[PDB]
DNA sequence: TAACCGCCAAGGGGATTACTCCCTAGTCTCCAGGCACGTGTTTTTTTTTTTTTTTTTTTTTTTTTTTTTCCTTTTTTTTTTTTTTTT
């Protein structure tokens, strides 16, 4: 479960980086609650279990 | 201290004259090795076919039967409608 947490945390950081990179090039700010997709870790753990 | 010079003495052999003789210069005449020409048979090069190991590819993995579980996409870009602001 630690290894799955590593993989899902890396995927979550990649998605957060993608979101803030596509919302940083226009000069505007971003929302931290809208930045994190909460379904990724829960969906991955549910599928792998 | 003996080179050098002067003086004297002795002898040895190269120069000279003559006689001889014998070996080569010259001239035919026969014939045979020396040389010009042709070429070879080994030597190197090139192909040719095989050999031998390595590497890669491909195919395979006893049969029958009965229950669940999860999934049978998903984000990402483009479009299209809606709403708000301005003159």
Swiss-Prot record:
Protein family per UniProt: Belongs to the RNA polymerase beta chain family.
Domain of life: Eukaryota
Subunit and interaction comment: Component of the RNA polymerase II (Pol II) complex consisting of 12 subunits.
Compartmental location: Nucleus
Protein name from the UniProt record: DNA-directed RNA polymerase II subunit RPB2
Additional facts recorded: The binding of ribonucleoside triphosphate to the RNA polymerase II transcribing complex probably involves a two-step mechanism. The initial binding seems to occur at the entry (E) site and involves a magnesium ion coordinated by three conserved aspartate residues of the two largest RNA Pol II subunits.
Task performed by this protein: DNA-dependent RNA polymerase catalyzes the transcription of DNA into RNA using the four ribonucleoside triphosphates as substrates. Second largest component of RNA polymerase II which synthesizes mRNA precursors and many functional non-coding RNAs. Proposed to contribute to the polymerase catalytic activity and forms the polymerase active center together with the largest subunit. Pol II is the central component of the basal RNA polymerase II transcription machinery. It is composed of mobile elements that move relative to each other.
């Amino acid at each position: 479960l630690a290894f799955l947490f590593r993989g899902l945390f890396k995927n979550l950081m990649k998605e957060v980086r993608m979101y803030t990179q596509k919302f940083i090039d226009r000069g505007k700010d971003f929302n931290l609650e809208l930045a994190i997709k909460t379904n990724i870790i829960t969906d991955g753990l549910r599928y792998s279990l």
